[PDB]
Amino acid sequence: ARKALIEKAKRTPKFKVRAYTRCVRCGRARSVYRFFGLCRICLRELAHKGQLPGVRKASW
Amino acid sequence: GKGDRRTRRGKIWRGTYGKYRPRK
Amino acid sequence: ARIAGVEIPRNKRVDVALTYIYGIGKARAKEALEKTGINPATRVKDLTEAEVVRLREYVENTWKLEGELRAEVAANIKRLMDIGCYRGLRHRRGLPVRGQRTRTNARTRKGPRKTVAGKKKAPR
Amino acid sequence: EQYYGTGRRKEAVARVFLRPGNGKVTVNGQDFNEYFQGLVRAVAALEPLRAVDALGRFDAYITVRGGGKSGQIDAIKLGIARALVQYNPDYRAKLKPLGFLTRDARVVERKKYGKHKARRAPQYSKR
Amino acid sequence: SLKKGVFVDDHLLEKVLELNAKGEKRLIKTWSRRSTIVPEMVGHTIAVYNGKQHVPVYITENMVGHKLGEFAPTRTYR
Amino acid sequence: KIRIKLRGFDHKTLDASAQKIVEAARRSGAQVSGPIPLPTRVRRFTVIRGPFKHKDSREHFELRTHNRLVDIINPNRKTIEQLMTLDLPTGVEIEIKT
Amino acid sequence: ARRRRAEVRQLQPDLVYGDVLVTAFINKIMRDGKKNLAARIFYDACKIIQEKTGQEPLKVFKQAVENVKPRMEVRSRRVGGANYQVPMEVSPRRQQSLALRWLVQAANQRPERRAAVRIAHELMDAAEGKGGAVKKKEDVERMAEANRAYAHYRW
RNA sequence: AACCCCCGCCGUUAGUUGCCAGCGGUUCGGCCGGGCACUCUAACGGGACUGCCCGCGAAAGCGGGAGGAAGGAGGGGACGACGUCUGGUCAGCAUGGCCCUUACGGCCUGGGCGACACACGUGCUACAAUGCCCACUACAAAGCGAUGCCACCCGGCAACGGGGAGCUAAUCGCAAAAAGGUGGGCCCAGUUCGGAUUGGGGUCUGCAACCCGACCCCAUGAAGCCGGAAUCGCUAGUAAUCGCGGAUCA
RNA sequence: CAUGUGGUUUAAUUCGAAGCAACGCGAAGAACCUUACCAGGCCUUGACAUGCUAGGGAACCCGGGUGAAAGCCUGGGGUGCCC
């Protein structure tokens, strides 16, 4: 149940409580950000290539 | 102490308000 | 200072003294001291014949209170031997009645640890 | 008419204004020993003056903002002394000889991942 | 607790109400352990699913506030 | 009378978009309150480096949004002529008020 | 550590007596970083001196602490299949540190309910020449002289 | 190592945050006209190089002194060589090979992941007077917010619930930091210490809180009076202690 | 007392991680969702992709019955084109 699920995520069946998140690149269920629509990995991969405007290597 | 939910710090620690910690 | 059944405190501020009754705590205490108008700071050590009776009057007449309070709570738990709600067991098996981790703690409801045990490795 | 000097210590900032007068000092519209009452220690902020021999000579107006109440007392100590060195180049043979001219760059260091508090590493197991 | 309502399933009541119509006997299967026992529903034995099989629970006045699952254990021996 | 908002992720292209609409705006009539710097709003994104499990050693970034503000004292025809049309935002964003 | 001699951190004087030795003592009183509560006690106890003794508290405390300093002590050492407590001298820095620590601990074992009272009383006793903190001093020095057998391992 | 970011000192540029700093009117609220000198905000710079002096040395450099906000890597970051553990991950994804193709695929309703005679690791609240309880009174930072954070009212013991202003947010909101300060109570007790457990009564999200949610109120107040053999952390704004925010998210 | 694991238990109590360098770890959110596990009811070119054949239907919108839902049975609005 990997493919059947990412497709279940899109539809919104009965009771809106069921509507979970899900990563865009990665079928990722856990660790999924509102701002980017992405997973923790998916994100970090991108951020190094510059495909995310102004998301820079932090340092404080 | 911090687990006595019928006090000042009981409520502060928990993060709540109520009779024993007046709201605002 | 014999208010409820055979219940008696002394040499302490009456707000606190009243506490040593079953079915009287901090709140039901100062609630009563206002409906009888009695300075809480006064010790049981010193106060009117009647102050006491007026106190006893209010308290004893109103809510209950050791014996048949105790006895109510017991027949409550008896009655959860009905067709046998999940909460009814847990009172038969003497385990927690409110959704809790038994695999570790739970010591307050199971009397001291029974170390009955064994598990090995391959000796060679 | 006035003397000015700036003072800051650890997320706390103070503005020092002086006027030759009797003594009285007010801060955030309050007597000194009313804002810092009970903090039996505050009274140290004034020690730069006791090293010039003039404390009966001025009437400072100060406004201090941010951080925490003791850090503030250090900031005042910096501004009081930074005001008077201006109005006397020859008052450098008391200020630099003591610690009253420098800032205190000591600051709360950063909490780091994999620890509890920046340096307290968590408790070891092995078993 | 749900304080405005009584959250009890309909497919249950239909079968109780039309069975209240002269109070028939009662082999009545359900999956609504999440529902209340309603006042008066006495005599009416309801077989409750607990994950595995339908446990024939019988009904009495003293039990009323309590749900159906609250008489249908999901697990075996402690 | 007129309030303008210059928001964006790079400061060197945001300061340049400001300084422009000042030289090319004073000339136009009544004068202007030069670019004034609003506090930056930052957004941290912290997460564990490994795909599986090393719940300690990890890595985190931010996304900073710097702002500036400019106020022109009076609406002349030569001003609203130029600025109303010359919209050259490369990765800069703008809002206008009065 | 292993290269440099380590740093003898410098104290700032007291704001009521201008004595660095007095801040040192307040530090040892202090719990959980609460220096206000700390010095408050110290002084409240100086006040218990004045009442029950027309001596300058400053001078009492000064003597008390001196009377608790131990001249010598024992430090275990390995010789070869035997771990002996060898006796030897004490650093003047070390003398201070200990005497203060012992004073404060001596204080907290007394049966008086509020603190300052304890610290006061214990300081009085010490200067008079006979407190919990002196028994401790005495004890330690008895361990020397007894183990003077092995004093010829002065490391 | 150096170049890159955060904290320290000073300048230049800019004024809806700041300012009786100075006269001005103030229903005394930087509220008001006025004003960038302070404070701050964020952008471009200066500043330190063992360059100066004394001593030791062949040299590199070591010790010591002045000026300085700061020296001898000034305090924190990001950064981790050729390789090691047939280390970890086919369950984030990708991928060779293997095996199943009215089921080892797919949909739902209910259960389970939350079991408990026991055993170990990481933690929280404590056993109290350098303390606990109640009233009043101060001083932060970094962040977050449109079917979101909610000012302010009205009701309720309260959880919450009826109204409803500001807000795209240095212009409104979360918001009170807490320890502290002050004065009132407890008087050494298993206690006004400690808050586990069970009875009774309520609220809010959600289609739904029996197995399994969080809060609020009354009553119950368990074990614990500082811990066998053992065993962890931290060298300075660190340890200790106090509270605040954020991701995920009904 | 909270949480992670061993073990026993169970219809199932899903899988992984194993001295330091696994154990408040994947898990920065398990009541149904999640969800990989079990019991019970159902569905097959399939919940998703690419392309071919064939009459209907060629977009779409609203209900009825049955059931625990899923599913299966079933009543009505009816199409702006190259021409």
Curated annotation (Swiss-Prot), chain A:
It comes from the Bacteria. InterPro entries: Ribosomal_uS14, Ribosomal_uS14_bact, Ribosomal_uS14_CS, Ribosomal_uS14_sf. GO terms for biological process: translation. One of its GO terms (cellular component) is cytoplasm. Its cofactor is Zn(2+). The keyword rRNA-binding applies. Binds 1 zinc ion per subunit. Gene3D superfamilies: 30s Ribosomal Protein S14, Chain N. Pfam families: Ribosomal_S14 (PF00253). Zn(2+) binds at C23, C26, C39, C42. GO terms for molecular function: rRNA binding; structural constituent of ribosome; zinc ion binding. Keywords: Metal-binding, Ribonucleoprotein, Ribosomal protein, RNA-binding, rRNA-binding, Zinc. The keyword Methyltransferase does not apply. Part of the 30S ribosomal subunit. Forms a tight complex with proteins S3 and S10, which cover it. Belongs to the universal ribosomal protein uS14 family. Zinc-binding uS14 subfamily. NCBIfam families: PRK08061.1. Required for the assembly of 30S particles and may also be responsible for determining the conformation of the 16S rRNA at the A site. Binds 16S rRNA in center of the 30S subunit head. This is Small ribosomal subunit protein uS14.
UniProtKB/Swiss-Prot annotation, chain B:
Residues 1-12 have a biased composition (Basic residues). The keyword RNA-binding applies. It comes from the Bacteria. InterPro entries: Ribosomal_bTHX, Ribosomal_bTHX/bTHXc/bTHXm. Coiled coil: none annotated. Residues 1-24 are annotated as: Disordered. Signal peptide: none annotated. Keywords: Ribonucleoprotein, Ribosomal protein, RNA-binding, rRNA-binding. GO terms for molecular function: rRNA binding. The keyword tRNA processing does not apply. GO terms for cellular component: ribonucleoprotein complex; ribosome. Belongs to the bacterial ribosomal protein bTHX family. Binds at the top of the head of the 30S subunit. It stabilizes a number of different RNA elements and thus is important for subunit structure. Part of the 30S ribosomal subunit. This is Small ribosomal subunit protein bTHX. It comes from Thermus thermophilus (strain ATCC 27634 / DSM 579 / HB8).
Curated annotation (Swiss-Prot), chain C:
The keyword Disulfide bond does not apply. One of its GO terms (cellular component) is cytosol. Keywords: Ribonucleoprotein, Ribosomal protein, RNA-binding, rRNA-binding, tRNA-binding. Residues 94-124 are annotated as: Disordered. One of its GO terms (molecular function) is rRNA binding. One of its GO terms (biological process) is translation. Belongs to the universal ribosomal protein uS13 family. HAMAP family: Ribosomal_uS13. Part of the 30S ribosomal subunit. Forms a loose heterodimer with protein S19. Forms two bridges to the 50S subunit in the 70S ribosome, contacting protein L5 and the 23S rRNA; these bridges are straddled by the 5S rRNA. Located at the top of the head of the 30S subunit, it contacts several helices of the 16S rRNA. In the 70S ribosome structure it contacts the 23S rRNA (bridge B1a) and protein L5 of the 50S subunit (bridge B1b), connecting the top of the two subunits; these bridges are in contact with the A site and P site tRNAs respectively and are implicated in movement during ribosome translocation. Separately contacts the tRNAs in the A and P sites. This is Small ribosomal subunit protein uS13. It comes from Thermus thermophilus (strain ATCC 27634 / DSM 579 / HB8). The gene is rpsM.
Curated annotation (Swiss-Prot), chain E:
GO terms for cellular component: cytoplasm; small ribosomal subunit. GO terms for biological process: ribosomal small subunit assembly; translation. The keyword rRNA-binding applies. Belongs to the universal ribosomal protein uS19 family. This is Small ribosomal subunit protein uS19. The gene is rpsS. GO terms for molecular function: rRNA binding; structural constituent of ribosome. The keyword Ribonucleoprotein applies. It comes from the Bacteria. Located at the top of the head of the 30S subunit, extending towards the 50S subunit, which it may contact in the 70S complex. Contacts several RNA helices of the 16S rRNA. It comes from Thermus thermophilus (strain ATCC 27634 / DSM 579 / HB8). The chain holds residues 4 to 81 of 93 of the full protein. Keywords: Ribonucleoprotein, Ribosomal protein, RNA-binding, rRNA-binding. Part of the 30S ribosomal subunit. Forms a loose dimer with protein S13.
